Design a protein around this motif. Sequence first.
Motif, PDB file in Angstrom:
ATOM      1  N   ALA A  20      14.535  -0.143 -20.127  1.00  0.00           N
ATOM      2  CA  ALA A  20      13.695  -0.528 -21.259  1.00  0.00           C
ATOM      3  C   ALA A  20      12.384  -1.178 -20.822  1.00  0.00           C
ATOM      4  O   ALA A  20      11.307  -0.670 -21.134  1.00  0.00           O
ATOM      5  N   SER A  21      12.471  -2.296 -20.104  1.00  0.00           N
ATOM      6  CA  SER A  21      11.272  -2.989 -19.638  1.00  0.00           C
ATOM      7  C   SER A  21      10.635  -2.190 -18.510  1.00  0.00           C
ATOM      8  O   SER A  21      10.063  -2.749 -17.576  1.00  0.00           O
ATOM      9  N   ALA A  22      10.760  -0.871 -18.601  1.00  0.00           N
ATOM     10  CA  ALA A  22      10.195   0.040 -17.620  1.00  0.00           C
ATOM     11  C   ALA A  22       9.281   0.972 -18.389  1.00  0.00           C
ATOM     12  O   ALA A  22       8.616   1.827 -17.813  1.00  0.00           O
ATOM     13  N   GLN A  23       9.276   0.808 -19.708  1.00  0.00           N
ATOM     14  CA  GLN A  23       8.421   1.605 -20.573  1.00  0.00           C
ATOM     15  C   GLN A  23       7.260   0.712 -20.983  1.00  0.00           C
ATOM     16  O   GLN A  23       6.223   1.189 -21.447  1.00  0.00           O
ATOM     17  N   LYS A  24       7.448  -0.593 -20.810  1.00  0.00           N
ATOM     18  CA  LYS A  24       6.407  -1.554 -21.130  1.00  0.00           C
ATOM     19  C   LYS A  24       5.353  -1.411 -20.032  1.00  0.00           C
ATOM     20  O   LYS A  24       4.158  -1.603 -20.268  1.00  0.00           O
ATOM     21  N   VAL A  51       0.583   8.444 -15.765  1.00  0.00           N
ATOM     22  CA  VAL A  51       1.720   7.814 -15.099  1.00  0.00           C
ATOM     23  C   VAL A  51       2.823   8.827 -14.806  1.00  0.00           C
ATOM     24  O   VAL A  51       3.037   9.763 -15.576  1.00  0.00           O
ATOM     25  N   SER A  52       3.518   8.636 -13.689  1.00  0.00           N
ATOM     26  CA  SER A  52       4.601   9.536 -13.302  1.00  0.00           C
ATOM     27  C   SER A  52       5.840   9.255 -14.147  1.00  0.00           C
ATOM     28  O   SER A  52       6.953   9.589 -13.751  1.00  0.00           O
ATOM     29  N   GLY A  53       5.640   8.640 -15.309  1.00  0.00           N
ATOM     30  CA  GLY A  53       6.757   8.315 -16.180  1.00  0.00           C
ATOM     31  C   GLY A  53       7.778   7.465 -15.444  1.00  0.00           C
ATOM     32  O   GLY A  53       7.533   7.068 -14.305  1.00  0.00           O
ATOM     33  N   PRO A  54       8.923   7.146 -16.067  1.00  0.00           N
ATOM     34  CA  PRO A  54       9.939   6.334 -15.389  1.00  0.00           C
ATOM     35  C   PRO A  54      10.920   7.225 -14.611  1.00  0.00           C
ATOM     36  O   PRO A  54      11.585   8.083 -15.198  1.00  0.00           O
ATOM     37  N   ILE A  55      11.002   7.024 -13.297  1.00  0.00           N
ATOM     38  CA  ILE A  55      11.896   7.824 -12.459  1.00  0.00           C
ATOM     39  C   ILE A  55      13.209   7.096 -12.170  1.00  0.00           C
ATOM     40  O   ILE A  55      13.208   5.958 -11.699  1.00  0.00           O
ATOM     41  N   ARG A  95      14.722   2.107 -10.614  1.00  0.00           N
ATOM     42  CA  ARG A  95      13.704   2.813 -11.390  1.00  0.00           C
ATOM     43  C   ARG A  95      12.430   2.959 -10.555  1.00  0.00           C
ATOM     44  O   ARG A  95      12.213   2.201  -9.608  1.00  0.00           O
ATOM     45  N   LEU A  96      11.584   3.923 -10.906  1.00  0.00           N
ATOM     46  CA  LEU A  96      10.362   4.150 -10.143  1.00  0.00           C
ATOM     47  C   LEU A  96       9.057   3.907 -10.909  1.00  0.00           C
ATOM     48  O   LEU A  96       8.473   2.831 -10.802  1.00  0.00           O
ATOM     49  N   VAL A  97       8.606   4.910 -11.663  1.00  0.00           N
ATOM     50  CA  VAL A  97       7.365   4.848 -12.459  1.00  0.00           C
ATOM     51  C   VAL A  97       6.160   5.520 -11.783  1.00  0.00           C
ATOM     52  O   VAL A  97       5.885   6.692 -12.038  1.00  0.00           O
ATOM     53  N   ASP A  98       5.439   4.781 -10.940  1.00  0.00           N
ATOM     54  CA  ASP A  98       4.272   5.328 -10.238  1.00  0.00           C
ATOM     55  C   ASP A  98       3.098   5.646 -11.167  1.00  0.00           C
ATOM     56  O   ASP A  98       3.164   6.581 -11.966  1.00  0.00           O
ATOM     57  N   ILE A  99       2.024   4.869 -11.048  1.00  0.00           N
ATOM     58  CA  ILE A  99       0.830   5.064 -11.870  1.00  0.00           C
ATOM     59  C   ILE A  99      -0.301   5.721 -11.076  1.00  0.00           C
ATOM     60  O   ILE A  99      -1.018   5.039 -10.340  1.00  0.00           O
ATOM     61  N   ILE A 100      -0.463   7.034 -11.225  1.00  0.00           N
ATOM     62  CA  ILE A 100      -1.525   7.751 -10.522  1.00  0.00           C
ATOM     63  C   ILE A 100      -2.869   7.228 -11.026  1.00  0.00           C
ATOM     64  O   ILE A 100      -3.002   6.872 -12.199  1.00  0.00           O
ATOM     65  N   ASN A 101      -3.859   7.182 -10.134  1.00  0.00           N
ATOM     66  CA  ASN A 101      -5.189   6.673 -10.466  1.00  0.00           C
ATOM     67  C   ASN A 101      -5.074   5.162 -10.641  1.00  0.00           C
ATOM     68  O   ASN A 101      -4.744   4.688 -11.726  1.00  0.00           O
ATOM     69  N   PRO A 102      -5.332   4.386  -9.572  1.00  0.00           N
ATOM     70  CA  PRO A 102      -5.244   2.923  -9.650  1.00  0.00           C
ATOM     71  C   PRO A 102      -6.219   2.350 -10.677  1.00  0.00           C
ATOM     72  O   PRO A 102      -7.111   1.567 -10.344  1.00  0.00           O
ATOM     73  N   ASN A 103      -6.022   2.751 -11.931  1.00  0.00           N
ATOM     74  CA  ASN A 103      -6.853   2.337 -13.054  1.00  0.00           C
ATOM     75  C   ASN A 103      -6.978   0.823 -13.169  1.00  0.00           C
ATOM     76  O   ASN A 103      -6.001   0.124 -13.448  1.00  0.00           O
ATOM     77  N   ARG A 104      -8.189   0.320 -12.951  1.00  0.00           N
ATOM     78  CA  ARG A 104      -8.447  -1.108 -13.042  1.00  0.00           C
ATOM     79  C   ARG A 104      -8.393  -1.546 -14.502  1.00  0.00           C
ATOM     80  O   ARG A 104      -8.392  -2.741 -14.799  1.00  0.00           O
TER      81      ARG A 104
END
Lengths: 60, 155, 127, 125, 80, 98, 24
Positions: free
Chosen positions: F16-20, F32-36, F68-77
């Motif tokens: 849950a606190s992986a979608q936040k 985002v690579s969504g939640p893995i 869980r993973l996630v991974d946010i492509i593009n280090p968006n500031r």
Amino acid sequence: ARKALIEKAKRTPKFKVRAYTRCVRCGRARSVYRFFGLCRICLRELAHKGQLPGVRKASW
Amino acid sequence: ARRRRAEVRQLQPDLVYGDVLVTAFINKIMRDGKKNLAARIFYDACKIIQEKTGQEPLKVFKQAVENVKPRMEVRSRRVGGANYQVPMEVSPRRQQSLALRWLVQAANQRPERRAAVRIAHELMDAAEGKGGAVKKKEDVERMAEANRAYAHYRW
Amino acid sequence: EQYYGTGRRKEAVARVFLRPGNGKVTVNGQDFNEYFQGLVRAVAALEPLRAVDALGRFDAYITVRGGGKSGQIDAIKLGIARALVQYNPDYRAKLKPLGFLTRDARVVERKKYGKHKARRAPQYSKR
Amino acid sequence: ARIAGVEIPRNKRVDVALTYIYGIGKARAKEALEKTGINPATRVKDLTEAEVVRLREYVENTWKLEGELRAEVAANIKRLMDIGCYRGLRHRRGLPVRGQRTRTNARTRKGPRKTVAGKKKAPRK
Amino acid sequence: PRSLKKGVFVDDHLLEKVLELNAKGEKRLIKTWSRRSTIVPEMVGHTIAVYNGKQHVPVYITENMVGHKLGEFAPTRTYR
Amino acid sequence: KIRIKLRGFDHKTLDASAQKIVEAARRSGAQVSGPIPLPTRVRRFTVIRGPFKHKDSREHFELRTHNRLVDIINPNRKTIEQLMTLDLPTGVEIEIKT
Amino acid sequence: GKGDRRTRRGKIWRGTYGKYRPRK
RNA sequence: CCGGGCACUCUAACGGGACUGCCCGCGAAAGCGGGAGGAAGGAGGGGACGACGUCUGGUCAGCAUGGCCCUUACGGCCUGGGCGACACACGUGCUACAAUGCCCACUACAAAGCGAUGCCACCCGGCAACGGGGAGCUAAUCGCAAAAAGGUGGGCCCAGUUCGGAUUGGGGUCUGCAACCCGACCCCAUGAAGCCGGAAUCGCUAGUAAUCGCGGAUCAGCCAUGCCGCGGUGAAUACG
Ligand SMILES: [K+]
Ligand SMILES: [K+]
Ligand SMILES: [K+]
Ligand SMILES: [K+]
Ligand SMILES: [K+]
Ligand SMILES: [K+]
Ligand SMILES: [Mg+2]
Ligand SMILES: [Mg+2]
Ligand SMILES: [Mg+2]
Ligand SMILES: [Mg+2]
Ligand SMILES: [Mg+2]
Ligand SMILES: [Mg+2]
Ligand SMILES: [Mg+2]
Ligand SMILES: [Mg+2]
Ligand SMILES: [Mg+2]
Ligand SMILES: [Mg+2]
Ligand SMILES: [Mg+2]
Ligand SMILES: [Mg+2]
Ligand SMILES: [Mg+2]
Ligand SMILES: [Mg+2]
Ligand SMILES: [Mg+2]
Ligand SMILES: [Mg+2]
Ligand SMILES: [Mg+2]
Ligand SMILES: [Mg+2]
Ligand SMILES: [Mg+2]
Ligand SMILES: [Mg+2]
Ligand SMILES: [Mg+2]
Ligand SMILES: [Mg+2]
Ligand SMILES: [Mg+2]
Ligand SMILES: [Zn+2]
């Protein structure tokens, strides 16, 4: 767990070998799991009380 | 089996003769669940039934199984005083189970040094009226009929 | 063009892609009789075809991983049966009886305590 | 033919045969036929008088065998005993000599089982 | 098939005590509680009383005894 | 592109606190690579029920660590804003890199 | 068999390695 | 292997589905027999879970606790020994007695777990145990790692043997202050009993029994062939 025996706690055992584990809760020497510091009995009691985080009754 | 009547198991027909009876025999030959090694054996031996016979192995096999089937056998039963060996018909299924169990048993009593040879020769010898298995079948049949005096304990 | 049914057995997963052609089957590269052979069993994996009467019409690229070969041999029996369904669904009406479409739930039973092997119980004397 | 000591192996693989030699195991055999270019698979009776020689030559001088070895072993055990060694006393009365339990087992070192009278009133089960 | 490695062990309670009895003579008797110490050359001739867990046994030492531990000559158990 | 790894004992305190830390990155950064998922590390403890003998009872205990993973492509500031310090999980631990 | 210290099975069963069961 | 893409396998989270609903028969009903569809039926398979009570059951040496007893010792520290004793007897197991086998070589499919003074790739020395060096790994990204039985080829040829590895001699590695009492491990030599076990007796009804190997807990190391788990192969039989 005789008291003069809970002397275990000795960062100075004289020889790393003599350094045996004991139950953090009862002093119980045998069956003292390492991930908990507790013994086989205490581990079951507490897990039942819910005081062991994550610890659950496994079935499969 | 106290409650039910125990249905019988069905076996996947043979990966060759496409016959179930063959698989049955294969399983009796099996040991420690080595069904591969078990299967080989029956087959090699199955070949050896030829170049020793111009006949098809299956026909040989199926007729050996036949001469080893007992039509009567003696079962126990206490009747106050002791146990009376009571003779009686053998069900169509036990006949088969007995026949095959007996072949593998007699086969492995043979002197032939290697398995496939043993099953092969026992298969053959059986097919023509002789061999360990047929002997057994006749000792049994002789047991029954030798106790005709206790035939009235039907059951 | 192509057809694909999965198929699983005793913890074995088989990818079965049937493609019109001769009928030369591959398995993790190796030829069918290259990944098997020596296993009197194997021949049965291709029974799905024989039933519908295929063989000479489909080729087959297969992936196989998990468990043991005789298990794989059976997962593949489903692939070649499930993929063979996408082709013509009027085939399901011919594999139902044969049961090639049925997944085999039979699996290793858990090892229970007190026992030696789930059911095999230790022996006692009582004297 | 006859090699090391008064022993003569026969009609069977030279390696297997060399085994009938005392101090010669199965490892020493593989080595001898190795350091003597003899095919281990050849049946002794089919050996060359030349090979038998090259073979005898090696084994004889390179290892202690037959009577020789026994004399040594027998000699070592004797020493253990002569010096009051514990390991010696075990040999003194044929009891396990390598820290083995003797409450039960130890039959090979003790030999036949010499049963006696006992207390059956208490379930020794 | 025994073993120890590359650094033979011997308790220094006597390791030097024994050698000292050589510096000015040889002396008589010795009392140890280290049945775990290997026997070395400089001990031969001496007479050490090893403890068998209960007492100190007079263990005379000979050349053909080097290498063995002292305990091997002080039997702990009393049998039949 | 920021490697994210969420571990925990609760499959909701993470899942849950992986979608936040994904929704608060969907509109402020990449996709985002969504939640893995990622396999779990189940640690089992088998102990004897009774305090003395009766060694054929036992009863099992597991302590499974979910991941869980996630991974946010593009280090968006611009994503680092919504995130940074705004959550609700108490039984979680985070390990993240660039 | 599994009891022979100087064999493959001997080493497998005893879980070890060595001359008779090299670590590849 | 890289670009690449998440269809597939998979990973882990939610949810779908089976209810005698669905069809013929018997039935008063519940339900029973059979089929169809379906991956699955009729409790689909395995767990967690075990009433009022019983046995003056087991544990005051896990812990808690009334009473009782010892308080230069029934308390305490330590070194060493003992718990490892061996004429004997029993239980539970291990490895076997072999050719459906053993050996060597080569070649193939697994699951669940563990890993920082930790698992240890790969390299060099050593027959080897292991030693020296050293990459990666906060571990679906690296390691333990080989799975074994299996398949292929060669050997052995019915022998107490190329079966079986007890016992004993020698040499050595390793953990640890230290391996005599009393560790495991490698290598050479030795090479025992055992030819399938009296009366008697135990387990198991299906992926079970049987058989094969793999991991972990405790732990420096280990006397684990034990225990708690994993998956490979895979039966017979049940009239009653
Ligand atoms: K039992
Ligand atoms: K003996
Ligand atoms: K075996
Ligand atoms: K269920
Ligand atoms: K009571
Ligand atoms: K038997
Ligand atoms: Mg107390
Ligand atoms: Mg310790
Ligand atoms: Mg402890
Ligand atoms: Mg199993
Ligand atoms: Mg010899
Ligand atoms: Mg002893
Ligand atoms: Mg052998
Ligand atoms: Mg071997
Ligand atoms: Mg109804
Ligand atoms: Mg009616
Ligand atoms: Mg219930
Ligand atoms: Mg009582
Ligand atoms: Mg009592
Ligand atoms: Mg004890
Ligand atoms: Mg026994
Ligand atoms: Mg090398
Ligand atoms: Mg061969
Ligand atoms: Mg032998
Ligand atoms: Mg024999
Ligand atoms: Mg039993
Ligand atoms: Mg350990
Ligand atoms: Mg031991
Ligand atoms: Mg193990
Ligand atoms: Zn405790």
